[model samples]
Target: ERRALRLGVNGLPNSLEPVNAISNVGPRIVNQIFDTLIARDFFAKGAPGNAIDLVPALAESWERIDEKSVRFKLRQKVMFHDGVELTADDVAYTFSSERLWGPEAIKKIPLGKSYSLDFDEPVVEDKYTVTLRTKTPSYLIETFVASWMSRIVPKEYYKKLGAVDFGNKPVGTGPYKFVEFVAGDRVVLEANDAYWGPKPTASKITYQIVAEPATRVAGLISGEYDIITTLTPDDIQLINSYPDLETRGTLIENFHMFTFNMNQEVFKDKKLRRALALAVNRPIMVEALWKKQASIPAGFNFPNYGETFDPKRKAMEYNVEEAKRLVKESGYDGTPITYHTMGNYYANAMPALMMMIEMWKQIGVNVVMKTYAPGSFPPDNQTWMRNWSNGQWMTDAYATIVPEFGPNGQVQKRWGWKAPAEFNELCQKVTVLPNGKERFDAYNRMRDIFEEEAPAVILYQPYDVYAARKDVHWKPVSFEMMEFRNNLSFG
Candidate 1:
């Protein structure tokens, strides 16, 4: 068998520049050619896995020196693709460069509001040692650097080449070395023999951009591609039916995700929130809109986080009459619910919102959908009826619970959700507590408060579908993320 891998994706990135690449396709490629300081712990696929933990990648070990500071011992002898040794300067700069450091970092990237929540600063203590300090005590520093797009950019390489040229010719300390990037076509990478970790089994891997699902599936069938992601639910069975092909489907925990910005006036009342949730028919949404590929979540983070997720919890049932009674009790005499959402962001955005609105209208609630143009979303706007795309990028409970609901979540300010001080207090309390019975108890309490508060409703857990040839195997964690060097190996 040939020791070469070819992958077809849905689309190429708008830009290969990691600092500015808003598209998923970009990071999917960039992550392979680069290595993060730390990495997310791997777990079994398609299951309720463990809590978020850090596995050393570039960094060999780490220690929590204090409440606000943590120090990492970088793995030595790691060289960039260009043969330059990786050092603390590159690690520090990768975090704080004009492109990716500071609280205002969200302005530069596609991460959610307050994505810079737990991130503060990175300090280079020595060539192989670095310390990360959070303004407040944070449980997220390790992961913020490890998971999702925190690939360490070589400082000297970047300085010599500058941003554009550096991105075009990247030099990372990973199992794969950058070969060439043909815009909108393919990104080629050769296996790094001098990699600090496991050497890639494949000699080379080509990431090809193929927008059409049919075309990708056809490629897999015809042996044009050794693998491909972006498989549609309609084609999963088609790929799996072949002995030479395989289909992988996992709930993307964040997709079909909805978040409520509490800054809007109409969402001020808890009664209205509870009533609104009771109005949706989850079955129809998951079946008709999602093509029966998605799972109806009993609650948030279901099937991904093992213990923390509440499987038996049902906050609201589809009872329009009950929703009507609750609406009337809340003294909301037909005040229009102002939902500010991006038009066409999600496939079923308008239809799902429209259906929910009609159901609410039957319940005597005038729910109005205020759609916004892409990049024109008014931050102070309220309510939404469609996809929550990037809320849960990491496998941690804080990833969703904090940003989507906490006072710091920036969601309350947007959706006008004013909860008691104790609500935020509980969130803070849970953060400092070590992962154990007590922390989970605090989180459990915090989650229950939101249930009563009705911050947001996730109707369905969306699936990230993929198809690949049996000749080579690739592991997928994020919807568009692939640690190619680690996730792939030839048969």
Candidate 2:
């Protein structure tokens, strides 16, 4: 049977380099085109139950040679769609190539920091063997290998094209190959028949970008789209009510919060930050926006992440009286605060900002709403309020922390957050240790400091919702990864 699926997603990613597009729309599409060293089990699921199992992908298997390194046995005869054969060199380059990490990638793209894998230059031992060396006994190294960041690409092809040209026309060892990409609209991929694994039944996969929630669901209902993501609570009800449509409600390790421009400006005042955080009323925000679909949680990195997960946690209390008092203490200069928001990113972003505006106004603060085109973030006149939904890969606390709130997070679009130096110092100490109590306790200390500092009003965690039509069966995973590259046949 010919399976040609049309999928819809939220905002478009800025770049196609998997790790470079952290917590963005890039992974969902790139997963179809690239093959990682190891793969995460989609069956384990990201919500409630976080039992993750790593399976072989590009490399058939691996052996932990020592405390700081592993040797991977490459899958023989696995060729890139472009006809170049997969080799140990490709795997080594994907991780440590200067093109990806050097001044080129940093200059072309806004690389907030280096990729997650803490490793030295890999050794291409033989034709089909490669040894990966890390700086320390990193427990989540294997997990990171299975993640989007560790996806292996053709080193030669990628180097020739550079970041922009390469992402525009990517070649990989996955079941599919990139056909075309229309930024902010769609990306098209065709099946790679000579794929080493089970060939995808789908002749083509078209990733349609529909920013509006109602429009996306309508496409599914009207048969224009086979799969869609980020279904709101109302959209879930709609899908359930309608036959031939279904939604998968899964929990994700993403904390949806708004950030402050900590370098300078209105939110620079810690009292002002605390006051606004208390005034938002997270429970009401969740109810008014996400309904019962989301959760108000403690710790920016959810507890499910294990060792690096913060134990010493406290949820931001919704104290209206305290909010008002802080407003007085914050020195009432009456400088209107502007929320940097656009309706495209989230379902109820604009409405939620409007709600916060009214609430802040009641507390005797002059707040205003400023809008910008979606994807056109960090605008010149961008205000104190910025949108955030920081997500992590695998069980590593560093994966989430270093990327979202750390000094060099991928989310460091503007001012790289400056938490206490001890927090940064502790982060370096624990990131290299094996998953143990020592690491966990150190991470918790950092989390405690982070919460106390209140860099941003760390808010709620939204449920991972996958809405698809009955014509094709699909399931969503923690990292916005869909696992049915070859199995997704027409239902």
Candidate 3:
């Protein structure tokens, strides 16, 4: 019998690629087997590794001199699973490979354009040091490096398999080694005893793809899993009935909101967008659907972890009369608006959208609901672009905003929405500023733009709830990430 720590999750499509992969499911699976150069801690500290509290695994230490340049001291004596020593050449090779072969390869990928392979050649000063230079200042470089975007791979291993074959077989310098991944079933990983850091406590880690809420809860109650993540409120309530289970919640780096394609003739009027924002009853949704498990979002972005979120400063209240006035002013007498949602992306999204559709209809706006599978909506889809012609919509508050309104701001062009030149210029200015007041100022300005423009109605910031066996001693970290191997173990 194999000693394994079986894990279960409620949402994640069958796809395994985290680069261009759209679903949150990929991160739950891939973070185990891959390593990013930078990491964040529970307090959102910019450190190293892929999960809470960065400890040196690949690069020993890093330095930032001004916003434009960063240098790293690679760890010596580190080796990949295949027995090849990690080197500066490997780092350079991985960056080059991701640029040439990763999901960015798709032309229509949302963040594809913001990603550029422009970096000063990594100078191997010696076996232990490598310096990397950027063309301009990039404040989020560390964050990007830590994200799924920056999984480092061995150049030699990839060249032999090539891009097409490499997607299924991945090699990385991490605690867990990839074993086998079957689409729509499960993904498995075995611990790497020779790992640079402390080896994983569990011999094996597995992610069982369970899309149905009831089935996932059933699996958990039946002793089918040691850990399960991404549960809905009802599932949480159901699992709480068992005393053998424990529940933990954390604020995740995700948001739910709707987008307006400014290119769409119907959405061309700013007042209409504002009307849409004011018309929806966000408070009701939070109470009825989210069960107050989510924080009421302020402005377009959530405050950095551990920072105070001032609700009064960014809150949007419901006013049906004002919404109706704005809609009429925008020249829409009674034109129907279509809202698109995925059943698998967010728990209760389908029902919430239906409720929203009914609410909007009450304000003299005809609303039609369209549903798509979570995986079906890739970053680059022509249908998504075309739907925007009439100002199509979706629901995701923080997750949607960062990808579109963050410093790099990729979604504007992805769906043909034009951003103000000033907004773009400010984002560029903030990137090079050392992490301090100046960077926060840039972030503040970005938030102000989204708030005033009503780019999307940021409904609520939800807490990521996890249910696990009582025998498991695990502490959930940031809303953005969860790493069982690092901060978890069997009691």
How does model 2 fare in lDDT?
A: 0.73
Give the range where candidate 3 is weakest over 10 consecutive residues by summed lDDT: 389-398
lDDT of each: 0.69, 0.73, 0.62
lDDT pick, better of 1 and 2:
2
In model 2, pairs of residues that clash are: none
- Poorly placed runs, candidate 3 (over 4 Å): 11-18, 43-55, 97-121, 305-312, 374-403, 406-410, 435-438
- Predicted structure 2, TM vs. truth: 0.90
| TM value for model 1 | 0.81
Ranking by TM-score: 2, 3, 1
Of models 1 and 3, which has the larger lDDT? Answer: 1
Distance (Å) between predicted and true CA of 322, model 2? 3.1
Whole-structure CA lDDT of model 1:
0.69
Estimate candidate 3's RMSD in Å. Answer: 4.9
Give the Cα error of residue 149 in candidate 2, in Å: 1.1
RMSD to the hidden true structure, all candidates: 4.2, 2.9, 4.9
Report the lDDT tens digits of candidate 3 across residue range 371-461: 6664576443322211221000111121234445654554575454556676677666554555555655665676677666765667666
lDDT per residue as tens, model 2, 316-367: 5778899899989876688887777765365567777878888899888887
